[PDB]
Subunit: 349 residues, 4 copies
């Protein structure tokens, strides 16, 4: 009926579809604030979270992330005991902040119990499809048992899903269905929402409740992070940009004189190992990047420049005030180096 007619009405934008419009500024990049408050008990000095993936974040990454002012989410592909131990390892390293991923399973509360005993700062109820009754029920259950626990729930890509998770008791909503570098959800299932639109739609709803959103996935360059925050996210979550730094789990492997690390979807064959569901992610390799610090300095540096250009003395200004301009593929081609043969790779390109 009405739904038949509306089938093709909506349009969505992703990072490469837009640029931020420069505005009047009296702030230099080095003077801007990149601090962000997710809740009364979860305040970050930089708006970056490392993904809860088995090739991105265990304790060493979470420690390094927290020291940089961000947050690491310890992944769930390990025993309850192992995960609680990893969380504890971060906490004893100076009381740094740490998060931990939990799936929607029968043993989820048991896992959460142990993580809370280990002093975890946030639980991520991490699911392929956040807008499901199973997730909502689990959030309600956790919130009822743990009234003060930071609950990040996702992933979602619509205002309605956002509303549903907030009402169930989530105090942070994680946004992103299909944008991940290692993701095949869009190809396998045909499902997704271009990430900038997802963030904006979800932020529009979350704003109404004073709830922050995390822009998760699809960020390839520091400028994409600026765009995600300007689209309304309080913070971003990164997988590929952190895979391959020294502190990520996994060994550095050498092939034809170059150092690589494995990076894979949590929905890839190998990760799911560690009718039945078909994979929704791939396994790959990324160049070894060296220490996390060097990568974070480039990311935050890019954000500082973007904020300076937008006249954003802080992230709240950026979310509330920054404006985009839409462009075509031709626009995109102009927006990367062109017609010159690059001889040195830059630290941020």
């Amino acid at each position: 009926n009405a739904m038949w007619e509306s089938k093709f009405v909506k349009e969505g934008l992703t990072f490469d579809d837009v640029l931020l419009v420069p505005a009047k500024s009296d702030v230099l990049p080095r003077e801007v604030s990149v601090k962000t408050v997710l809740s009364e008990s979860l305040q970050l000095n930089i708006p970056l979270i490392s993904a809860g993936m088995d090739t991105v974040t265990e304790a060493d990454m979470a420690i390094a992330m927290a020291r940089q002012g961000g947050l690491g989410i310890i992944h769930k592909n390990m025993s309850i005991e192992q995960q609680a131990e990893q969380v504890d390892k971060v906490k004893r390293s100076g009381g740094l902040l740490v998060g931990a991923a939990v799936g929607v399973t029968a043993d989820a509360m048991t896992r959460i119990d142990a993580l809370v005993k280990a002093s975890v700062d946030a639980i991520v109820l991490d699911t392929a499809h956040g807008h499901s009754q199973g997730v909502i029920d689990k959030v309600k259950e956790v919130r009822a048992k743990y009234p003060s626990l930071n609950i990040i729930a996702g992933n979602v890509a619509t205002a309605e899903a956002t509303k549903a998770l907030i009402e169930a008791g989530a105090n942070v909503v994680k946004v992103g269905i299909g944008p991940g570098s290692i993701c095949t959800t869009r190809v396998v299932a045909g499902v997704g929402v271009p990430q900038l639109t997802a963030v904006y739609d979800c932020a529009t709803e979350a704003r109404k409740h004073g709830i922050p959103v995390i822009a998760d996935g699809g960020i390839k360059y520091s400028g994409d992070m600026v765009k995600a925050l300007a689209a309304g996210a309080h913070v971003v979550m990164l997988g590929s940009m952190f895979a391959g730094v020294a502190e990520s789990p996994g060994e550095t492997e050498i092939y034809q004189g170059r150092q690589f690390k494995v990076y894979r979807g949590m929905g890839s064959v190998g990760a799911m190992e560690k009718k039945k569901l078909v994979p929704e992610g791939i396994e790959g390799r990324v160049p070894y990047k060296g220490p996390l610090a060097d990568t974070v300095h480039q990311l935050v540096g890019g954000l500082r420049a973007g904020m300076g250009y937008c006249g954003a003395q802080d992230l709240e200004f950026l979310r509330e005030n920054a404006q985009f301009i839409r462009m075509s593929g031709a626009g995109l081609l102009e927006s990367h180096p062109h017609h010159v043969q690059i001889t040195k790779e830059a630290p941020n390109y």
Copy 2:
């Protein structure tokens, strides 16, 4: 006059132009129903049909397709006796469902007579241009002689053509002009309709009569099938995705240590062999895929995931309720794995 002014008004979308929007779900992929009813006497457990092409479907493919819950269309590039024998071969293999392709020719009724004697379940009146008087007349003729016979007629790409075939007596309409992987109609003749729009337009009309449509051609990934069904098709027909499985006709050929099978348009030089019309298809090779079962499991698995994401407990929900969001080429680039070097090929990518 009016037609002069309307020349460039219409716009069309294809698979890569859109994504399905995730919606509230209380169904897991393994719990959804993928059954579909084409008519009282033609009910499929999975919404897949193998193309009536001489490099896709003869009896072995049709048997394997039927056992998986789908349907095979035996191609028409053989004698009447040979085709009837192939149909009979499928029927004696446990009374499985089978379809058979027939062209618009003088000997079409003779061919149909033999196929009906062999207990065929559906005839496909298969033509390059379904919206022609020749096709309409043939459908009327067949329907008059065989009041209870399932008649699938096509191909078409517009509401008007759909209306015309239904009124002539077709009880299933096959949709697709120009989307095929091996098709050159669009390049040679300049004619076609982007496939998602074709399906939607044709379904809009067919719905009015309670008539199902088949989305035929252009499907490259399991997600495209989800999109076709969500655009209104009851089922899809596949050529390239089934070419190269063990049960397809033709020998496996080896070149530089790799196994390939031939896949060609029915409008290619070679197929037409087996002024005068210029070819509208090409001849190529596809990688050997192994048994049909493995490919069908990946396809249906992808559909199950897509339905779960859309909260579609069955295909009727998907057709009636699923919503799309339009994206740009940038959207498409985000929607495939990006900026990571894939090291293992996935079973579904």
Copy 3:
């Protein structure tokens, strides 16, 4: 003022932006008429003209084109005596039709005088920018001296230019600024109009006077020709598709065991040889195609198919009634063979 505000309002479409929509047909490709009337004294059995270029048309090409039912334009990069001799050569070959190109120069009337004495059927006043006072004045001058002479004037890309040439006395208008395969006008000068829009806009005007237009340039496949005619042109002019056939001027040259012929813009350095203007065309090579007949049979065959699909029993129906549907780059990708490794090249792809 008003002109400042309108600077970016117009939009233009080219061949790859659209497809023709299939319509009700009771005509087979072999039954359609491809005849076209340009004037009382210029009637073509096929709607194809070979370009007046020094690597496309001299007498041998013009003879072959005329025998196929089309028309050749003898190029102007030769002496007056040589050109008149070439025209005469065509006329004595059975009184076949022939055209001849003339520039806007002081000696243009002298050249035209000789061509008329040689019994030329049409003069092409061939200029880079048809919408100029020099061209208009030359047309008026020629028309005054030769009231019954077929005058094809161009090139233009707008309704206003079309109106101006018709009022000056041109009885055929040639359309195309910047679409040519060998053209660099758009890159060098920044000027042009996407060719399908140019044809449609110019045809809209010319129709008002009962004047035909020629769609000149940019045609890469037989389907592009169908699109040009459906956009309103009576006929098309081809350069690249005829370069390299046996009857085109120039030697067949062999490089690494393959036969090529030179094809170059008339605005390329070499052609202009045979402050000062910068080149607006390039010099290249095209594969040797064999005899003109084989190429024309493929072109006309493609047109016949397109007409059949559109239900166009003749070209007037196509111009007046055929409808397009707009598509994206994704649409284009679906509209060529995809995801299959082509093993044999087709005669029309």
Copy 4:
């Protein structure tokens, strides 16, 4: 609030998104005027300025540019004494025009003092983000001390920024944030405005005050320059198109038998040498082009053709009257040579 709703409303066009529409002309390319007046004391015979970059313009380039009728901006990556000496070198070479770049620094006035003593014709206050209070304050300060000095200020990309610089006292505004060939601002910071839209928006404002704008960056072909001027700029500034000519600074380097010169962003690691800011430009190499004269002749030749096509007897006509037509990526593909194998490189392609 309102700003939240407007976030994605604006759209922007760049060079490759449009073509100029041919119009009635009675002017040949060789007859048009390409002169332009930037101020009472800054009149150029050709509308070209070479970029103030350490791989583009020092005294030799500025001398060659001025002799061609244009202007060179001496870059600021040298001591105050060195820059004043370079300016003096140009002035003593026949009193040719010369400009000089100055940053927003504490020592800016000291640098300007010396440049004025050396008889510089224009100061370029050259900054990454022109729409900042620091820039506005510096312009006001310079204008107060030097009431008659030509002050070019930038870069900006919006009407508001343009208004702000003009009110502060700039008499020429330089437009371009992110379009440069060597620029990574858009990737690193996520900020920019497609250049044709930037020029048009800024010109719309500047026009109101009788102030000219310079279209700076992103020009890859002579046709892009025509488009920039037609979008409203009085003149263009070029980096990449002048890098690699004999008169640019830096040595010609030989690698595998080919001559190259270094070309780099002023925001690249190396240039910035000659927390802390991350780079916003890359370092590369461009082919050696020979003398500046040959490149300028091709550029101006392209402009002359474009003007002829537009019927623009002068640049004021072009800015005020020329019209564009928007195209898709398909339009772009038609607008470059296609389907022909180029055998000779042209002087302008």
